[PDB]
């Protein structure tokens, strides 16, 4: 029902198309579909194609997670080790607990060091100012940077922690920090490490972080069009591009561009656990609850908050979930849908991916929206992909 649902959204003019890639571990059931059209900078239209270069936005976080776990394999990092020496900027942040009645900020020194595991699971305290009202308020007052000057990760995320390290959960720049850590301990750029350790082993050559300078990639960027002549990825993240525009260096949180075909190669290596990226035991460890008890309660509060629908990635409020290394982790089966310990996340408002080891399925669905982006319709279109792909999988299994 992707087909009739996606076409109806094209006919209303609210999307231009979609890219969907899914596969079981062995490549028996494979579904790859590009739908609709893209617009070139000239105004010329072309059919959407499976090798169009997509903005991943926060689907970058999964790839940065792998890179950081590969550094763990190398012995350059550990999951629970103290990051204060590699990332002194993180050690220096205090913990904002709230405000007075005269709106004065109450903070406290951090009770413990920040660790890689905390960065990978959004339990370090580093929170996105646009999701955290307390950090939003703090930013309004003690930050008035209206200078557009490009900033490094460490110059962009200057806010205090939202909670004591390890005790809460809030979506934030934890993977931008982790990417910076990976650069500092490897002595090269995040892209250099990923190209060597993730993209090369999978035969991936059509990848770049923002800004996409490669001419061959620019010729296939869906997001290089008259509505987005900067190729900022506006349609994916609901509008803007501010953060990409303002940035300097790779952002492990959001910055990657990649085809749908190449992204599903990454998903499928983790699904098959084929040793191409990480040793099998390190992959297994990704599909576990890595929030402690207090952090897990905070996660569930966030999931019941007004932002909860974004944080749930389409899973039902009655489904028990945690946070693994790489995304949301279901903690129970949904018959006919995600098995327990399915890992899932997404990018912006338009893209979502999942890895379901129990039922042997992974996939990415990436809507190519038209500005202004209808957020409510994007949620329906993503859900349609997430459920219809299991319908298509069952139909195929039934035909054998
Ligand atoms: C910058 C990208 C961010 C991290 C992202 O793409 O994460 C995705 C993934 C999804 C599974 C869960 C999410 C949870 C909360 C948000 C709705 C977020 C999108 C924010 C984006 O729409 C605006 C920013 O870019 C700020 C700006 O543009 O002002 C989304």
**DSSP codes, 163-197:** SSTTS----STHHHHHHHHHHHHHTS-HHHHHIII
Looking up tokens 């900067």 gives: 230
Write down the H helix ranges in the chain: 2-11, 60-74, 88-91, 116-121, 133-142, 153-156, 174-186, 190-194, 215-218, 242-245, 260-272, 280-286, 293-304, 308-312, 375-398
Looking up tokens 């910076």 gives: 180
Pocket of ligand 1 (CB under 6 A): 57-58, 130-131, 171, 237-238, 240, 242-243, 253-254, 310, 313, 345-349
- Say if residues 364 and 332 touch (Cβ distance below 8 Å): no
If DSSP states are collapsed to H, E and C, what string results for 249-307? CCCCCCCEEEEHHHHHHHHHHHHHCCCCCCCHHHHHHHCCCCCCHHHHHHHHHHHHCCC
Atom 23 of ligand 1: nearest residue by CA position: 237
Atom 29 of ligand 1: nearest residue by CA position: 240
Using DSSP, state whether 369 is helix, strand or coil: strand
CA distances from 194 to 4, 68, 299 (A): 37, 10, 29
- Say if residues 315 and 338 touch (Cβ distance below 8 Å): yes
CATH of the domain at 1: 3.40.710.10
Atom 18 of ligand 1: nearest residue by CA position: 348
> What number of CA atoms fall less than 13 Å from residue 52's CA on the CB side?
30
Give the number of other CB atoms < 10 A from CB of residue 185: 15
- Say if residues 71 and 104 touch (Cβ distance below 8 Å): no
Which residue range is the domain that position 296 belongs to? 1-400
Sheet holding 256-259, edge to edge: 53-55, 256-259, 208-209
b/e map of 14-45 (b: 16 or more CB within 10 Å)? bbbbbbbbbbbbeeebebebbbbebbeeeeee
Atom 15 of ligand 1: nearest residue by CA position: 310
How far is it, in rounded angstroms, from Cα 295 to Cα 286?
A: 17
Q: What's the resolution in A?
A: 2.3
How far is it, in rounded angstroms, from Cα 133 to Cα 315?
A: 24
Q: Which two tokens stand for residue 242?
A: 């501010």
Counting the structural domains of the chain, the total is 1
Do you find a cis peptide bond into 372, omega within 30 degrees of 0? yes
Give residue 148 CA to ligand 1 midpoint distance, Å.
Answer: 21
- Say if residues 348 and 236 touch (Cβ distance below 8 Å): yes
Atom 28 of ligand 1: nearest residue by CA position: 240
Q: Which two tokens stand for residue 16?
A: 């231009």
How far is it, in rounded angstroms, from Cα 174 to Cα 62?
A: 12
Q: Residue 340: is it exposed, middle or buried by C-beta count within 10 angstroms (0-12/13-18/19+)?
A: middle
Looking up tokens 């209206």 gives: 146
Q: Which two tokens stand for residue 260?
A: 């749908």
How far is it, in rounded angstroms, from Cα 166 to Cα 111?
A: 10
How far is it, in rounded angstroms, from Cα 209 to Cα 274?
A: 26
Pocket test for ligand 1, best of 56, 58, 342, 372 (most atoms within 8 A of CB): 58
Instruction: Please identify, by atom number, the ligand 1 atom nearest to the C-alpha of residue 348.
Output: 6
Instruction: Please identify, by atom number, the ligand 1 atom nearest to the C-alpha of residue 236.
Output: 22
Using DSSP, state whether 323 is helix, strand or coil: strand
Pocket test for ligand 1, best of 237, 239, 299, 327 (most atoms within 8 A of CB): 237
Using DSSP, state whether 385 is helix, strand or coil: helix
Q: Which two tokens stand for residue 270?
A: 């983790």
């Amino acid at each position: 029902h992707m087909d009739t649902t996606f076409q109806a959204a094209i006919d209303t003019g609210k999307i231009n198309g979609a890219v969907v890639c899914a596969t079981d571990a062995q490549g028996h059931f494979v579904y790859n579909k590009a739908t609709g059209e893209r617009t070139l900078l000239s105004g010329e239209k072309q059919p959407q194609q499976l090798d169009d270069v997509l903005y991943l936005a926060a689907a970058t976080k999964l790839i940065t997670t792998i890179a950081a776990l590969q550094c763990v394999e190398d012995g350059l990092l550990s999951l629970d080790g103290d990051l204060s020496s590699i990332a002194p900027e993180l050690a220096a942040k205090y913990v904002l607990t709230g405000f007075t009645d005269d709106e004065s900020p109450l903070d406290d020194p951090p009770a413990r060091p920040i660790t890689l595991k905390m960065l990978l699971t959004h339990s370090s305290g580093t929170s996105y100012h646009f999701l955290d009202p307390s950090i939003a308020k703090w930013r309004a007052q003690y930050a008035n940077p209206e200078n557009e000057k490009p900033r490094l990760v460490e110059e962009m995320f200057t806010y205090p922690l939202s909670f004591q390290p390890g005790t809460g959960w809030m979506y934030g720049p934890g993977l931008d920090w982790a990417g910076r850590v990976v650069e500092r301990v490897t002595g090269g750029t995040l892209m250099e490490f990923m190209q060597k350790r993730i993209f090369d082993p999978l035969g991936i050559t059509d990848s770049q972080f923002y800004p996409v300078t490669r001419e061959d990639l620019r010729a296939r960027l869906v997001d290089l069009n008259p509505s987005d002549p900067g190729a900022l990825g506006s349609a994916v993240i609901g509008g803007g591009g501010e953060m990409n525009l303002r940035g300097r260096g790779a952002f492990g949180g959001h910055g990657l561009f990649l085809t749908g075909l190449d992204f599903v190669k990454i998903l499928r290596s983790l699904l098959a656990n084929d040793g191409m990226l990480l040793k099998p035991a390190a992959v297994d460890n990704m599909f576990q609850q890595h929030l402690g008890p207090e952090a897990a309660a905070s996660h569930r509060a966030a999931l019941a908050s007004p932002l909860g629908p974004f944080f749930r990635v389409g899973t039902d409020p009655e489904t028990k979930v945690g946070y693994g290394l790489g995304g949301l982790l279901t903690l129970e089966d949904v018959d006919g849908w995600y098995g327990e310990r399915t890992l899932t996340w997404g990018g912006g408002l338009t893209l979502t991916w999942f890895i379901d080891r129990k039922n042997n399925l992974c996939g990415v669905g990436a809507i190519q929206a038209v500005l202004p982006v209808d957020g409510d319709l994007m949620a329906d279109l993503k859900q349609t992909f997430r459920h219809d792909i299991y319908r298509k999988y069952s139909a195929w299994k039934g035909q054998q």
